[PDB]
Amino acid sequence: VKTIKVFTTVDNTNLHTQLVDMSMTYGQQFGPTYLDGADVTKIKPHVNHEGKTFFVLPSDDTLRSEAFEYYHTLDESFLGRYMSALNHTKKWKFPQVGGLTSIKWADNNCYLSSVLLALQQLEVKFNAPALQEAYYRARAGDAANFCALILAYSNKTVGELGDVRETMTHLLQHANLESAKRVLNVVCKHCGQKTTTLTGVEAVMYMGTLSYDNLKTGVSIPCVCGRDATQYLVQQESSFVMMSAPPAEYKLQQGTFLCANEYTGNYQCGHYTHITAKETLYRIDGAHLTKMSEYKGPVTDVFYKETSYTTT
C-alpha cells in the first residue's frame, strides 16, 4: 500500500492533511476533487502531488462550517459550481487596460469585465472572505478566482450572456453595506409626511433613471391613500451609488460621474463596454482602450462617488 501525503481544503486556508492510497482515484477517497481548478476526481495520485493542496466538497461538519465561514453561502452546490467556473476563468486573460484589470473577450464575458472594472473603482468591502481575498487578487491582475466566484454567486455559468445590474445586485448582498443608508422624504397631499429609510443594497442602487440628481428632484410613488405622492433624496450615507435604467441615450461628462456601462445591440444579444473618468474619458472594451473628449451613447448604469450627503 503506497501512499503520499496531501492537503484537502474548502477555503485554501484551513488545510487538512490526508494520506491518499495511490491504488485508488481521488474521487474514491474524497468525493469530487480539484487541483488548481482542474477536476482530478477520476485520476489516481501522482508522485508529484506530494504536498499539494486539493479542493474537495464540504462533506463533514468541519468542512461545512469552514465553507460557510469562507463563502457565506448556504447553497451546497456552490463550491462545485465555483470550481466548474474556475476551470474556464483560469484560462482567461486579465490585461491592465487604463490602469485597471480588464478581461480579454472570451465566453460572452463582456458583461463581467464591466462588473470587474466597476468594482475596482468603488470603495467596497465584502462580507465573505472568499470574495474579499479574490477581490484583492483581481485588482493585482489575477482575477480568475474573483470572476468564477461572481458567476457562482450570481447563479450564472461560463458562456451565458448577462446583465451588469443583476450581477451587481447579487455581489453587493455579500458587501459590507450595514452603514449604507438612504433617507427618502415622502409626503402625500392627504396623509402628510413620512420618512422612508433604505439600508444595505437598496441604499446604494436604483432602477429607473441614470441621473443621481433626478433622485434629489423627485420620483413618483404609490401611496396607500390612493394618490401619487413624491419622494426624493434628503440624505445619503455610502461610499458610492449606482443608478440604472434600460438602455437610453445619455451624456457622460468628466467630473460628473465615477464610471458607467454602455450597452449596444439587441436586448437578446448586446455588447457592454465600460466608461471611466480619469484625466479624460476612457472606454474600456475588454483588452481595448479608447480615449474620448465627450461621450453620448446608450448607457444602462452610472456609478457616482459619495460619502455623506445631508439636507439636515
Residues that bind Zn ion (CB under 5 A): 188, 190-191, 223, 225
End-to-end CA separation in angstroms for the chain: 75
Identity of the residue, 35 or 223, whose beta carbon is nearer to Zn ion in the bound complex: 223
Cβ count within 10 A of residue 256: 13
Q: How far is the CB of 192 from Zn ion (least distance, A)?
A: 8
Contact 290, 300 (CB under 8 A): no
Q: How far is the CB of 250 from Zn ion (least distance, A)?
A: 33
Q: Annotation-wise, does 223 bind a ligand?
A: yes
Distance CA 5, CA 95 (A): 37
Q: How far is the CB of 202 from Zn ion (least distance, A)?
A: 22
- What letter represents residue 242's amino acid? M
Q: How far is CA 97 from the centre of its chain?
A: 19
Specify the DSSP element, H or E, that contains 54.
strand 53-56
Q: Which residues are catalytic?
A: 110, 271, 285
Distance CA 259, CA 20 (A): 50
Q: Annotation-wise, does 191 bind a ligand?
A: yes
User: In degrees to the nearest 10, what's the CA dihedral of 231, 232, 238, 243?
Assistant: 100
Identity of the residue, 167 or 231, whose beta carbon is nearer to Zn ion in the bound complex: 231
**Residue with CB nearest Zn ion?**
225
Q: How far is the CB of 203 from Zn ion (least distance, A)?
A: 24
Identity of the residue, 93 or 190, whose beta carbon is nearer to Zn ion in the bound complex: 190
Identity of the residue, 190 or 296, whose beta carbon is nearer to Zn ion in the bound complex: 190
Distance CA 217, CA 257 (A): 18
Of 296, 179, 188, 203, nearest to 249 by C-alpha is: 296
Cell of 11: 477555503
For 238-307, strand residue ranges (E) read: 240-252, 259-266, 269-277, 281-285, 288-292, 295-305
Q: How far is CA 144 from the centre of its chain?
A: 13
Identity of the residue, 35 or 221, whose beta carbon is nearer to Zn ion in the bound complex: 221
Cβ count within 10 A of residue 245: 18
Q: How far is the CB of 207 from Zn ion (least distance, A)?
A: 23
Residues within the annotated binding site for Zn(2+)? 188, 191, 223, 225
Residues within the annotated binding site? 188, 191, 223, 225
